[PDB]
Amino acid sequence: GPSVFLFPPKPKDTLYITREPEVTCVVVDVSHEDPEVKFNWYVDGVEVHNAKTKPREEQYNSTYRVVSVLTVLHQDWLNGKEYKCKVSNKALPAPIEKTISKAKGQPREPQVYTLPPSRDELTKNQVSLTCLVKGFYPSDIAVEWESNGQPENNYKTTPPVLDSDGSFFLYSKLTVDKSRWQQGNVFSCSVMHEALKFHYTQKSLSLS
Amino acid sequence: GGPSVFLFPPKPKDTLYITREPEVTCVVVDVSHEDPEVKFNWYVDGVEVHNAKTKPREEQYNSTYRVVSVLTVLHQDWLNGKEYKCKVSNKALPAPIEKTISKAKGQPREPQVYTLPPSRDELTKNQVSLTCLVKGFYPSDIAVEWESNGQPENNYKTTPPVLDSDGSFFLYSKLTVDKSRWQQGNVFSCSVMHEALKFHYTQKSLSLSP
Amino acid sequence: GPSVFLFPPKPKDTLYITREPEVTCVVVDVSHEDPEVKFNWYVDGVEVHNAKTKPREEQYNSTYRVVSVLTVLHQDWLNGKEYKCKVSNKALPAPIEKTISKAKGQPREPQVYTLPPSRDELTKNQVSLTCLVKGFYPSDIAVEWESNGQPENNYKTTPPVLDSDGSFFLYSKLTVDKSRWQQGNVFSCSVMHEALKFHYTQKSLSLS
Ligand SMILES: *[C@@H]1O[C@H](CO)[C@@H](O[C@@H]2O[C@H](CO)[C@@H](O[C@@H]3O[C@H](CO)[C@@H](O)[C@H](O[C@H]4O[C@H](CO)[C@@H](O)[C@H](O)[C@@H]4O[C@@H]4O[C@H](CO)[C@@H](O)[C@H](O)[C@H]4NC(C)=O)[C@@H]3O)[C@H](O)[C@H]2NC(C)=O)[C@H](O)[C@H]1NC(C)=O
Ligand SMILES: *[C@@H]1O[C@H](CO[C@@H]2O[C@@H](C)[C@@H](O)[C@@H](O)[C@@H]2O)[C@@H](O)[C@H](O)[C@H]1NC(C)=O
Ligand SMILES: *[C@@H]1O[C@H](CO[C@@H]2O[C@@H](C)[C@@H](O)[C@@H](O)[C@@H]2O)[C@@H](O)[C@H](O)[C@H]1NC(C)=O
């Protein structure tokens, strides 16, 4: 301390005109002895002044947390612009600098595959519906589930995992009551990624 | 300023296999060139032990040393929750640094293992994905491998454990095989080792269905 | 003078990770005049200090028995490490050293075969399920039975028998109610051995 963490936008914030992507600069372990924090922001090395800095917030471990948020243009993030947060504090020998950008490398479109429950799981009261998303680059991605136009919320999805060919994959597991699966209800896995056309794709799954 | 200590647990394949040696690893970084010697004292449930293995120091790029001591733990001791303490002494430290490590606490829960064949739409590709779903296990320490007709198979990747809504963990392991190997009827096996299994091992097989 | 006997661990203590294998150094004929006994222990020539010495026990013939117990690492015993107990006593002209190790020789993987009851045994209220385990080396092995994820405890296993080719074989007999066998219940013979892949294999048996 003080230490700085620079966070990227959320994957869905970059992909839809609907949402506002922005980069977040977090300073932790600010001592009560040195409460002042100054933020300077750079986009491709050019100083910018539109960042919104919040007032310091006291933490339970008797240190301050200070957050500055820079609202980022959609196309700028996807085109690989560089965002640098410069953090100044009197307890620092020199200011702390962090830089973030989207991963470089040619984007690769995710391949989406839905997998029904394993035969041995059909014995249980609730079954697992699986969505395999593989071969995508970069790793920023979002996955959701629906049934009959309505969102399904009983799902958990793994973080991206680096594959042997340089792309990423993950799995999403949706849990439903077995009865819903044998009624023949249709379930859909939704994937959001910059390499998809219109940044969206869908794959459905139902009893065969 | 000063050396820092990091204490690492044994790995789940070392702990669960009788022929391997599970080890607790005590790592000291930021060891200076002027005072490079590090003395390690090890304790199991507070009693000093003397079987630790000293590794050769390794010079780092920022002109400091990394110094490591490795304690082999009894298989049954680690699984019974004994506490392992590494005490690190160095002439640049005003007082020795102590770190303690133990196995994750909580009621153990047995993994459920399910194999999933490739998606119908993936069969058009030259390579297909065999999926192993491992769920409902606690703690998260687990090992997963793949075999083919009993033989080790290595083009697989396994996700990290993910916390489920009920407090247990799950993961997926993905094996990639040539379509022709799947279409020949070869049997593929997902093998998992976990402390909550009887015999600490279980396997589920998968092959082309008629 | 005193005599020393060095005993190996119990074979199943080495094959189960939750069990504790130990080598035991026993000294008998320790005199009343020279009661002091010192133990030094070595693993592959390296002295170790974790041995537990028991208190002297006076015997009926007016001599002492003194025992020291060394816990061996599972992998150390199985990898063929050599254990030396060195015993010093003032009545000995020179210390007595005893060495013990696992049987050497190429490990050979067990072949596991299940055998249903003989037709003539079906007249009885209880039947014998047989597990034949053959061709294994060394003779250290463990056999258990399960049904439907649960242990079956009504079994007995023969000791290993040396076969004509230098390997060992044994038989395990599980006794079950005939009705359980005729219901189609599946029974499994589980064996643990260092030469098996994953040190484990299982063979099932049910009404044909
Ligand atoms: C007082 O209480 C506050 C609570 O607010 C604490 O603040 C917390 O401080 C934590 C650090 O002490 C923060 O933890 C970080 O959280 C990030 C979570 O996203 C995470 O990304 C960070 O992980 C990186 O840095 C770690 C080192 O600190 C590494 O262990 C880790 O592997 C990560 O390292 C990066 O790795 C990638 C590749 O994988 C590299 O590309 C990066 O360059 C690496 N980063 C580098 C080298 O810097 C870390 O876990 C936590 O966010 C924060 N909480 C909040 C709400 O802000 C104070 O610590 C606490 N202080 C005391 C004294 O109690
Ligand atoms: C000094 O450098 C050590 C080396 O750590 C490794 O190498 C550097 C270059 C990075 O890649 C780092 O992420 C690696 O883990 C560090 O162990 C040590 O913390 C460093 N100490 C200081 C004070 O910088
Ligand atoms: C003295 O006796 C020691 C103990 O004898 C053994 O244990 C007792 C409990 C009896 O069961 C006895 O029959 C056993 O043989 C022996 O270890 C030792 O050899 C004996 N020595 C002499 C000289 O008699």
Numbering used by the authors:
A (entry chain B), C (entry chain C): 237 to 444
B (entry chain A): 236 to 445
Show me the paper's own sentences about this structure.
Binding to the neonatal Fc receptor (FcRn) extends serum half-life of IgG, and antagonizing this interaction is a promising therapeutic approach in IgG-mediated autoimmune diseases. One of them is an IgG1-Fc fragment bearing five amino acid (AA) substitutions (M252Y, S254T, T256E, H433K, N434F, or “MST-HN”). IgG1-MST-HN exhibits increased binding to FcRn relative to IgG1-WT at both physiological and acidic pH, but retains the natural pH-dependent binding profile. To gain insights into the binding mode of the Abdegs to FcRn, we determined the crystal structure of Fc-MST-HN, both alone and in complex with FcRn.
Interestingly, although Fc-MST-HN predominantly adopts a predisposed binding interface, three conformations for the side chain of Y252 could be observed when no binding partner was present, which all collapse into a single rotamer upon binding of FcRn. Thus, this observation indicates that Y252 is allowed to freely sample rotameric space in the absence of a binding partner. However, in contrast to this clear role of F434, the electron density around K433 did not allow modeling of its side chain, indicating that K433 does not participate in the interaction with FcRn. The crystal structure of unbound Fc-MST-HN, in which two opposing conformations of K433 could be observed, does not clarify the possible role for a lysine at this position.
